[PDB]
Amino acid sequence: MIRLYPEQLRAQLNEGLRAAYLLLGNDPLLLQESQDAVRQVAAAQGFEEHHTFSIDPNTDWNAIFSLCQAMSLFASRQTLLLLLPENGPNAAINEQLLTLTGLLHDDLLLIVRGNKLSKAQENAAWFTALANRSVQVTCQTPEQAQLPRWVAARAKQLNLELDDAANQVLCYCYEGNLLALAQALERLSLLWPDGKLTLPRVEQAVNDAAHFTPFHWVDALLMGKSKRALHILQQLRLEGSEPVILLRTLQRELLLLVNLKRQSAHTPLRALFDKHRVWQNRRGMMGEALNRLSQTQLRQAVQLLTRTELTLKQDYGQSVWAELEGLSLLLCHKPLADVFIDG
Amino acid sequence: GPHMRWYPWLRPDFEKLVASYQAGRGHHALLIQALPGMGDDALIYALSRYLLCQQPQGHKSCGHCRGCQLMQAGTHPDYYTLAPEKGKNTLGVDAVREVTEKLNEHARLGGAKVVWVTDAALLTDAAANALLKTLEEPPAETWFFLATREPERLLATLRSRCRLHYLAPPPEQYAVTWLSREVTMSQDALLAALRLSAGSPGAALALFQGDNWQARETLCQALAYSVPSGDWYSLLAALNHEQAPARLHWLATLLMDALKRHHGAAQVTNVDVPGLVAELANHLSPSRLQAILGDVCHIREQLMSVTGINRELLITDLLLRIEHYLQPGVVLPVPHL
Amino acid sequence: GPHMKFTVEREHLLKPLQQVSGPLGGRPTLPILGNLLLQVADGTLSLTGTDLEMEMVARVALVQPHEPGATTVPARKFFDICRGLPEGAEIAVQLEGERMLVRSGRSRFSLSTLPAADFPNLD
Amino acid sequence: GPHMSYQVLARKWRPQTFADVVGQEHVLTALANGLSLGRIHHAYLFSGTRGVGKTSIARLLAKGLNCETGITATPCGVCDNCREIEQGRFVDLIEIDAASRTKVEDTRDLLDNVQYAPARGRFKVYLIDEVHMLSRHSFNALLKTLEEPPEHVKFLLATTDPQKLPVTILSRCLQFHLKALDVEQIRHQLEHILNEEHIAHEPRALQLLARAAEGSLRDALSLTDQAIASGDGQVSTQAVSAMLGTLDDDQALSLVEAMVEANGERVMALINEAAARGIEWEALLVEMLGLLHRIAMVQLSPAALGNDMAAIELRMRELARTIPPTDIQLYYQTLLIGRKELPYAPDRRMGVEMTLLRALAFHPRM
Amino acid sequence: GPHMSYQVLARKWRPQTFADVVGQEHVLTALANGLSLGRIHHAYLFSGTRGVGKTSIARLLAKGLNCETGITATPCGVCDNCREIEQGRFVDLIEIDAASRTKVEDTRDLLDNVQYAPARGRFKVYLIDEVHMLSRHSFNALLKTLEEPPEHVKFLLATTDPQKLPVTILSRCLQFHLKALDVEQIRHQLEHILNEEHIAHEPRALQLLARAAEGSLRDALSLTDQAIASGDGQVSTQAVSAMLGTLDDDQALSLVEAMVEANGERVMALINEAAARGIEWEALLVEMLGLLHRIAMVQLSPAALGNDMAAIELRMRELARTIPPTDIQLYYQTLLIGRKELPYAPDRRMGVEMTLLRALAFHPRMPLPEPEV
Amino acid sequence: GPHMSYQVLARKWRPQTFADVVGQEHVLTALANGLSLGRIHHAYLFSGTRGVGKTSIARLLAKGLNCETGITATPCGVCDNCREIEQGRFVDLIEIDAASRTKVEDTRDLLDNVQYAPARGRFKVYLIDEVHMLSRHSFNALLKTLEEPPEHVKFLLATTDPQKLPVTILSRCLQFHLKALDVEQIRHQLEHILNEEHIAHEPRALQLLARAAEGSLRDALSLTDQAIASGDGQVSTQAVSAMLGTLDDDQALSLVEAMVEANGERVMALINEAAARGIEWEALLVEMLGLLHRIAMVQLSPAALGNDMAAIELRMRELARTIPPTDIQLYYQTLLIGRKELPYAPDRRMGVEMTLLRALAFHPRM
DNA sequence: TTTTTTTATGTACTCGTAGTGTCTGC
């Protein structure tokens, strides 16, 4: 199994088509781009007839197997496409994929599109049977730090000049939404075909259609970026995510921070992080937070968190969205008034 | 498993209650105010055995008629039970509605009908309201049985339409004798368990049978460690569990006994653990002890009442607020009118 | 517009109605495409049914006094009226305002129509 | 079989004629005047606390509306329609257990059939019981029908909690507030029915039942049936006293005098003794509330005291002679809050202990 | 009058002319001017509290737009269309109880038949009552029809809480908010109705009915019907006061005056008198709280008393001239706490009495003296 | 119907050329450059705020794509199909209200109509309005059609809520997001139509209409039509101000403005106006608490103001800058206590007024 | 580099299945 990124696919595709291609990632844009490149190269190499299927307990599997085992009157080369569910390949789906690999043939090219593969998913034997001769493509969304480099690289690929300001604006407005980022890049390239993009040109045709996760909010709170935390919170509210998800995601980390701040009086943070399986980036963020947070701030944060939880669960109130800004402004560097933490 | 474990203290009441049904003048709705695990379920089961029996005698079921056999097997077309669904501690309105709609048709075996709700305190407002009218004017030969921790906790409308029977707990000496017969342990711990169970022998016996006694010992040790130092956060390790309200109640009883010892009350709920209560009494002032007790009981009530609440956050915040109260110069809460 | 009239037998009308019903009756793309287009010309009757890509037209001979007009009447309702009449009874049809009147032996119906100007036709 | 299951008093003694109704004179007068004068409405909403008689009043109104004698203020009770509606087989009267048929599908299905004619009676009466349990969609489905129903249909809503109804529903109905029955009315009704059924009783027991029923005839009747079952066919004072929960001893006054003196030792000893006697804690707290109320009342105005019980009121005069009014007021407030939060306690005894410890903490030194 | 079977006060006196509406002037003028100028929008939403005239105004607009004569703001009472719409079952108006047609499967059927020409009249008036009850798919179906409807279709949308509508629906149509009626307008309408029905009435009873109506005329008129029932067909101060379950101030003013003067004996005597009358004890506390709140009103601004309390106005002002605002704060808070604690008192009379005792004992100017030491 | 004035301004003033759409340059220029330079996508998905021009711009795209004078941004409007698209119906422009045709049984027929060659124009144009309400199976069918679109068809989907669409549909559509129109653009447009409709107007009335438009030009046009109605064919400042005051719903923010300003008469007048509208009082207190919390968050950091409160951004910013935090905390405490005590009040109106009076007593004016 | 959500009841909506009315060349 050759594991690759969408940057390196072209050369591999020029090396020669592989029996199976597994497009796996959480990013729609990179998955679609890799799929388009694979299909274009296959069409160049004779693969003319394309078939698409969706994996589902409602999938007519017999039709898929017959198509994989039936020759066509025209364009004998065939491409099979599958769309993995959000849960990935289930055990029954794993057996179905094993049977499909058993019927894999030279004249048939197989493409798989779906979310990331969890360890158990590739543990299943069909994955290894494919990996004996296949290529896997990890289309994972670049993190916050890696976004400007990718945006600049794509801009240079698309033959348009981007400065630091426009790149920063695009990164701030389209994070986790690379599809909309490429839509905006096309929009700006077509709006002004001069190829030079600066702050005044890009500040017009860019909206804040970002896509975030609760982990982004928690990491923003940990790093102390109050403005970024508020941006993530507002974006998540506009998206419609359940506030209880945010409450739990913050609660786990906040309880860990409280315990580690309590324990820091006897043991340095280096051993404390290793005690409870804290990862390296998480180790750095947590160390920064524990150094920039006292006991009183953590206690007030927990008090506000439990007040918000009580408001949400027993009163069924709609003030949790506004109250979460209280935590956002309390954790970073700013103590809040007593009445807004208890009452 | 657990079944109709008849208890001696139900004997004077059961013989009475069946009499109210022997003359045929009994109320269709009998709400039993009995402490949990004290024996309300067994009494209701025996009463239903008498009621559904086609050929009964005296104060017990024949055990020979087909109704008795079907009742023993656990299946009967005229014996409906209303219990919380597996994994959920509530009684939905859908089950009550289905039962009420089934009551329209006649009894299959030609006898009477029994609808027994396991715990009326777990009724959802919609379910209790759907049961209101069915309770009021049931069809011919229909019998309702309800059990509750507290009758006043029920809906003010449902409880009105029901004859209320109170099962008096046995005197403390009789209960301690019964549990000494059942369990071979010290008298001090047994009396402490009986007082913890509000005098209900069944709840204390269940506490001893389960791992709750080990948990109480661990919590007492944690309190012993934490009282002089104020390291109340460690109590979380002993407090966070699926039975957190019981342990919060144990802590509340310990604070009760500390306040009593400061006031010098002759008898205490925690007689088996004098060292911990003495340490709590001397180390903590009564003014802050009252605030800690009130906050602990408030957290217990919040944890019990609102379903889906997170035990971790509530218990952690309670411990942190207690630690904050321990520090001098901090305002204390006052009960609200 | 107005003054259009039919006088047709059920036997000479039922079968062309079945032929022109086709796919009509279901929810259409446009509200008009549920109505058969009724036309009179040179003493013959034209039934038209359209699906934005189909057009089935049935011609019926007329030997009765009439008038060369046009209208659009709901397919299901008109077919049910023409089917429920007694066997051999003659249907007399006219128009007034936006109401198309159907008459048989001691029987009268009024149906809501649409102007022929809005009916789509294949170019 | 004349419905043997009716042996329960709450099912047998519901009134069948306007004259049989006890209390509720204002709503009865309004209904009688409306029926006699012809000022008939199409949406009556009888709202009040539980066990007051709004369902029975609504059924009597339906009987009066659908009687073959005419639109009479006093139903005959013997006509074919009256007998049928007593049997419950009357088609023209529809009783909706809205706490069970709360879905909107059933409400819409019912409202689509309002246009049809009644089978036998003049009016197609709709007895919607426990209206507040309907879904919001079910409420909003009723607006057009309640505004302008046909002349042959009438809605008789009956809720125990009018404030949960949408204002658009309260706006279309004649609201009849069923006043809670007084102690005297309950006592007289209980005496009348018990003497009708030839049941041994004592006037003091009836007074206790009326006072402890909390202004409801159904509660008093259920307590009477409980007393009958407990006392073997007689409503004896001792049995009902041990059942409802009474304080014949002066332990309440001793508890008050120990607490107001900040004597925690005596307070806890008295609590232990009372628990050893199986005291009912809520009745105990009620007695302390009454004692403190009388103490404050005599503190304001001399005499006008618990002259009923001279023995304790002498010591009460001493207490009113010593204790400042503010301490009495705060003690009463704390006892009341403890009674309020008594259900929200792991044990009733523990709740009373909480209340008394809070009372002690106000003046622990003095 | 005729009063054929007394077909309910609410239904009988529904407005039939644009001059008969009790004074929603801000919408009446707009509709009359739009009808006169020919600016007939194809969609507008009536909103406002209960029983104000939204449905009645919608019927009036359908009257004006369906009249045989030219489109006028003064529909005729002889017109065949006007008579039919008054009696209902009109050909053009389509009474659509949206609460009974929430499902989109019915809104789609409505939309399928929108293009058919009306049988009579000019505008096929779609009157949708309780619009906020429609399901989301129903609203989205209504969207494009409301944006570009047929030239002979007008939409008559009415609801109680317009905020529940999707915002684009609010955008596609005009908005008319019908303000709740003032007390004087309600009283004048009640006087008109009772005079036309020839029923004896008194000014105080009608003022009380208007006050208890809370700004909604349908409540006022149902309450007037219930008061007529309570009396022997006659509206009087005693009958309405008994029916509403309240006291006509005064008594409560004496209560609050004895409260502020620390005259506990008078407080107890007035409580005994109220018990003799047998009024609701919670009503006593509610009325005392209301009078204290009105005295606070007067304390803030002199022009805080309406004509309704004029009967005691000269008295009430004097209360605001002597009680410092902090004392009225303490009084109001104590009475509110007493009302909070009343349901848990040993007896309702006991709770009210203890509340009065606490109010007078905590009086700063005249506190209850400590007994001996 | 009668007389030309019946034409609704939301319908008659429908833009017909790209020079008529206003405030959407970032989409108009992109469409023009794409049409002129030959760059084209399989489908174009429009999105943004209500009443901004998504459907109008989609119709303009349909006009431009299907003019026989070449695929161009600016259609002539003289030839047959340009007029047929606007006046009457054009055969090759398929307009589908997806809200009316959510079920897959209609989208299946629609995609069975894509394999047929266009009649008049070169490009078969599909305009699907409110595409966010199609069913999931209909979305699957639409995705299947979009996977391999024939060269003679180009889709146009217009919607208000883009978040509901499948990500696989967004991936193949070049979404154009239209920003809410600025106040100045709305005012200039309203002045343009009013001057070209022979309707008198006054600049302050136009500014009020633009501010009340909330950014949607359709709202501005509807309020303009109502303002003309409220009066005699004249947009007077007094009539417009009265109409907006009648329709205004920001009682809470103006009320907290007056409360912090310590203007008791203004607070009472605002409470009167809120009572006239039947505003829920508990909801009013909840909104006021939310506003106070938000302004405190603004005081802590200016980033607390998101795009959700752009309408009232300036007022809240200025009331944050001018007011010390201590007054904010005291007012929040007073309002929270008042909301706690609101249910146990003689009525909600007097309870909320009493809470406001309590708040006004802190730091009053001379 | 793997990590996070409360319930109880009700109200629509859209789709396959499933069972049945009815009726047309079979």
Ligand SMILES: Nc1ncnc2c1ncn2[C@@H]1O[C@H](COP(=O)(O)OP(=O)(O)O)[C@@H](O)[C@H]1O
């Ligand atoms: N006004 C009354 N007159 C006579 N009996 C009454 C009255 N009110 C209640 N009751 C008694 O209470 C029982 C239940 O009355 P019910 O009318 O159901 O009260 P509710 O209003 O709470 O439904 C009746 O069976 C009757 O015995």
Ligand SMILES: Nc1ncnc2c1ncn2[C@@H]1O[C@H](COP(=O)(O)OP(=O)(O)O)[C@@H](O)[C@H]1O
């Ligand atoms: N403005 C008004 N003028 C005259 N009568 C009114 C008015 N508002 C309400 N009413 C009375 O209320 C009855 C019903 O009013 P309605 O318009 O249905 O209120 P709603 O807005 O709640 O539907 C009418 O028949 C009429 O008697």
Ligand SMILES: Nc1ncnc2c1ncn2[C@@H]1O[C@H](COP(=O)(O)OP(=O)(O)O)[C@@H](O)[C@H]1O
């Ligand atoms: N940008 C704009 N320029 C001109 N008129 C507009 C604009 N946006 C909205 N309108 C007006 O609103 C009416 C409806 O516009 P429409 O584009 O259908 O809004 P929507 O985005 O909600 O579908 C149009 O007829 C036009 O009068």
Ligand code: BEF
């Ligand atoms: F208990 Be009743 F129906 F209000």
Ligand code: BEF
């Ligand atoms: F009662 Be109305 F139509 F709101």
Ligand code: BEF
């Ligand atoms: F108002 Be748009 F067409 F969504």
Ligand SMILES: [Mg+2]
């Ligand atoms: Mg009832």
Ligand SMILES: [Mg+2]
């Ligand atoms: Mg209406």
Ligand SMILES: [Zn+2]
């Ligand atoms: Zn048996």
Ligand SMILES: [Zn+2]
């Ligand atoms: Zn009769």
Ligand SMILES: [Zn+2]
């Ligand atoms: Zn007319």
Ligand SMILES: [Zn+2]
């Ligand atoms: Zn052209």
